């Protein structure tokens, strides 16, 4: 089978370089050029330019003129991209892709270029304050807040509670990220049993659980 | 640069029905060589892209024969004869006939189901976060249809747009919904300074504002 | 028409005291939205209502802690665990489920104090009333308690209630009793056709009836 | 702080119309609902609808429809109820509420309907029986009959004598008022002091004295 394995997450300084690898294996590499494509904000797709891996000749988008360099190993067919002169503009997934046979893309690789330092989230539980509805169902919260890196993993009841849940996507505060949570039950498991948020934050080797607690 | 213009942007679909999508190229992508080079791709969410389709109508290794692609010279369209739950996502067409080689904005299929209006649920800030000089007011507008909705903050009757933070989900792979979370974060001085928050919703499935609402002493 | 049935009609409480009003729906009182929209307010006199208590068991903004609300179905119950004087005054439920929203007669909650037998006394026409053709007879019963009490008329033996109009004043706020006025209302020739004029009340305190009587040939 | 006023007291003809407002404070008055209530006599409340600030819907009381009309202005957050083709029975209190987290009420607005023209009061002196048992503490009074409209003052002996006084509400009788009040002195004050209970009537600017003596007449 063919594959294009991308190196993993990488998290830089404004300022620095990076190198991004593209290892192919499944054919004959030496042979089909690679391209590389940026994704910024999940949505808009954005070519690069390509390289011819024997030659060494590389065709790029004007944009991109000096702040990408394409080059390639023969040896263990593997192509490089280096991204120079690191911006915030620069954050984003990066994919390569040969054209053999039609297309085939690499897994993409993220890049995320700030000057934060790693921060442990503050974890604050969210119950319903002054009338929140005596009635049928009830909605709880858990604010994962002012966080870095990405990512964080956030489970209720040590994953018990799996129905119910809305875990929404992290933004982007003051350099640090914010997220939030809910999980809505029957009122008649809360309050009568405990429901906990819990969050773990790789990173900072973090691990904090959070009852949700009336009033 | 060669444009490339994709409609429509969202398209809602019935699994099982036949779909059409467009592409449309500001100038010709026909190449010297007597070959026209446009592809589709298909992106799911946290996946990378994979071809469907190259060189107009050529389908890529794997693809089911479902998929057919169509056109010439600057208009080209891709369809789905029989739509299924793995051909969700978002499909975006590709010229690689001339430098630069661009891509259109992309198409995103959702499925189509019966309008829901949120349930909205608002939250006062934590006594624990209020004793770091921090105070958050988040507001939870879950499962409705469709995804357009107007969510405004008012404190004291007064519209406040500075400080909010919105994230939202993805259609829900069990009912099809939506689900939002807007987030206004003060000062802990900010927020004594005023009583009445509300979280005001303005969706298609309601014809005055839903709201939730709290005062600052209770 | 759900019909609000409020028990009992007026309570004396002692300051300190732990009492339980009954609200009571001659339906069911649940609404699509899975609730009983029920609400407990209370009003002081020359005061407009005040919100204590809405959806059976939430207590409104600024409400202390001794109020607390509980039912179902067709029966609710308001529950004050201490008294406070800022407690005295009417009781009203009210269900918000079916239109027309109705409210409960009302509940007064009053200070209990000892027995008190009323003052009465009775008064012919002024010389000045009867001048300008009109007799009114009037009869106070002053400063007694409990509340209840049953006054009758009787001209030349015979029991009259046409004409009379009587005028309450509320509990007094230094002694705590109550105290009424009864005026019998006669033409000038009409009271010259008769004799014998006589207030005649019943009440807690006495075995018999209380009576004050004048003869017009005196 | 949430806030609902109302506008001051009024005094109609039968069969006009008056507007009754009900300004908002505090909160986004197009996002909550505006309800009207009637107190008779200061006991029976009734709901008379509602109105939806946006979008103007209204749901009523089948007992007030045509009666009232509830309007909006969304620019001065300030809701009306016009009470239309007026009659005795519309006199009573109206409060306007909302249901904004709980609810929150207005001041209440009170509303007078009679055909009545401004009337002084006749006040007469209400002396015991000759002597009612003679000794001890002795209840006099002042009856104030025929007057229009409310309120009247009644003092005795200038506001000197305050204690052991009752004035009791007035009631309506022929579209007119009257109200009584009673004082309670030592038999051993009256009837060698003099009493007397001074009345005025501020709509008339009527002024009255009248000492209470003895034998009943
Ligand atoms: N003339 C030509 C241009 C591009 C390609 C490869 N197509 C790609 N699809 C999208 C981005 C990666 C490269 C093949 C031939
Ligand atoms: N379903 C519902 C009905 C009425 C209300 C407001 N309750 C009121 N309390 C008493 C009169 C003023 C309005 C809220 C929700």
């Known amino acids: 089978e063919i594959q294009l394995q991308q190196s993993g997450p990488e998290l830089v300084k404004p300022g620095a370089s990076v190198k991004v690898s593209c290892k192919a294996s499944?054919?004959?590499?030496?042979?089909?050029?690679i391209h590389w494509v940026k994704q910024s904000h999940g949505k808009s797709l954005e070519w690069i330019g390509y390289?011819?891996?024997?030659?060494?000749?590389?065709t790029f988008n004007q944009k991109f003129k000096g702040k990408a360099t394409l080059t390639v190993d023969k040896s263990s067919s593997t192509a490089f991209m280096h991204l120079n002169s690191l911006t915030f503009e620069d954050s984003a997934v990066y994919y390569c892709?040969?054209?053999?046979?039609?297309?085939?893309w690499g897994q993409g690789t993220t890049l995320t270029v700030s000057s934060a330092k790693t921060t442990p989230p503050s974890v604050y539980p969210l119950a319903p304050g002054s009338a929140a509805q005596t009635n049928s169902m009830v909605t709880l919260g858990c604010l994962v807040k002012g966080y870095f890196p990405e990512p964080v993993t956030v489970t209720w009841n040590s994953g018990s509670l799996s129905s119910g849940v809305h875990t929404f996507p992290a933004v982007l505060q003051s350099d640090l990220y914010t997220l939030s949570s809910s999980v809505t039950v029957p009122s008649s498991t809360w309050p009568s049993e405990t429901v906990t948020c819990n969050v773990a934050h790789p990173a900072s080797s973090t691990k904090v659980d959070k009852k949700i607690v009336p009033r | 640069d060669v444009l490339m213009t994709q409609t429509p942007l969202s398209l809602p679909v019935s699994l099982g029905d036949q779909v059409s999508i467009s592409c449309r190229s500001s100038?010709?992508?026909?190449?010297?060589?007597?070959?026209?080079?446009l592809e589709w791709h298909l992106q799911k969410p946290g996946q990378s892209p994979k071809l469907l389709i190259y060189?107009?109508?050529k389908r890529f290794s794997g693809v089911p024969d479902r998929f057919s692609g169509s056109g010439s010279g600057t208009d080209f369209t891709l369809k789905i004869s029989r739509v299924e739950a793995e051909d969700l996502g978002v499909y975006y067409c590709?010229?690689?006939?001339?430098?630069?080689?661009?891509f259109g904005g992309g198409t995103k299929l959702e499925i189509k189901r019966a309008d829901a209006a949120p349930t909205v649920s608002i939250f006062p800030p934590s006594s624990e976060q209020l004793t770091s000089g921090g105070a958050s007011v988040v507001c939870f507008l879950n499962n409705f249809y469709p995804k357009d909705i107007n969510v405004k903050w008012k404190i004291d009757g007064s519209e406040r747009q500075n400080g909010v933070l919105n994230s939202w989900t993805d259609q829900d792979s069990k009912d099809s919904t939506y689900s939002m979370s807007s987030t206004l974060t003060l000062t802990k001085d900010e927020y004594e300074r005023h009583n009445s928050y509300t979280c005001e919703a303005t969706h298609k499935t309601s014809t005055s504002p839903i709201v939730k609402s709290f005062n600052r002493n209770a | 028409d759900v019909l609000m049935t409020q028990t009992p009609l007026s309570l004396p409480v002692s300051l300190g005291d732990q009492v339980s009003i009954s609200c009571?729906?001659?339906?069911?009182?649940?609404?699509?939205?899975?609730?009983?929209?029920?609400?407990?307010h209370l009003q002081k006199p020359g005061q407009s209502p005040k919100l204590?208590?809405?959806?059976?068991?939430?207590?409104?903004s600024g409400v202390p802690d001794r109020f607390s609300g509980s039912g179902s179905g067709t029966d609710f119950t308001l529950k004050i665990s201490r008294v406070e004087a800022e407690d005295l005054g009417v009781?009203?439920?009210?269900?918000?489920?079916?239109?027309?929203?109705?409210?409960?007669?009302g509940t007064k909650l009053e200070i209990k104090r000892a027995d008190a037998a009323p003052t009465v006394s009775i008064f012919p026409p002024s010389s000045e009333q009867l001048t300008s053709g009109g007799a009114s007879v009037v009869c106070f019963l002053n400063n007694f308690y409990p509340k209840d009490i049953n006054v009758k008329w009787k001209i030349d033996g015979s029991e009259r209630q046409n004409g009379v109009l009587n005028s309450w004043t509320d509990q007094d706020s230094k002694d705590s009793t109550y105290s009424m006025s009864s005026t019998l209302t006669l033409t000038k020739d009409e009271y010259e056709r008769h004799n014998s004029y006589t207030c005649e009340a019943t009440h807690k305190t006495s075995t018999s009836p209380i009576v004050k009587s004048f003869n017009r040939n005196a | 702080e949430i806030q609902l006023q109302q506008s001051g007291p009024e005094l109609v003809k039968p069969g006009a119309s008056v507007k009754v407002s009900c300004?908002?404070?505090?909160?986004?008055?197009?996002?909550?609902?505006?309800?009207?209530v009637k107190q008779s006599h200061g006991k029976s409340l009734e709901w008379?609808?509602?109105?939806?600030?946006?979008?103007?819907?209204?749901?009523?009381?089948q007992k007030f429809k045509g009666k009232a009309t509830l309007t909006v202005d969304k620019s001065s957050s300030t809701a009306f109820m016009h009470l239309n083709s007026l009659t005795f029975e519309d006199s009573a209190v109206?409060?306007?509420?909302?249901?904004?987290?709980?609810?929150?009420?207005?001041?209440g607005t009170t509303l007078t309907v009679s055909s009545a023209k401004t009337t002084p009061p006749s006040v007469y002196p209400l002396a015991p029986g000759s002597a009612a048992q003679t000794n001890s503490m002795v209840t006099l009074g002042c009856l104030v009959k025929g007057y229009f409209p409310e309120p009247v003052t009644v003092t005795w002996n200038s506001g000197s004598l305050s204690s052991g006084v009752h004035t009791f509400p007035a009631v309506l009788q022929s579209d007119l008022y009257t109200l009584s009040s009673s004082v309670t002195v030592p038999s051993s004050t009256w009837p060698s002091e003099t009493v007397t209970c001074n009345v005025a009537h501020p709509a008339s600017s009527t002024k009255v004295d009248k000492k209470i003596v003895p034998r009943d007449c």
């Open positions: 892709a040969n054209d053999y046979d039609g297309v085939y």
């Open positions: 499944g054919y004959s590499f030496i042979d089909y050029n």
């Open positions: 390289i011819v891996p024997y030659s060494g000749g590389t």
């Open positions: 100038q010709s992508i026909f190449h010297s060589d007597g070959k026209t080079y």
């Open positions: 060189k107009v109508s």
């Open positions: 590709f010229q690689g006939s001339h430098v630069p080689y661009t």
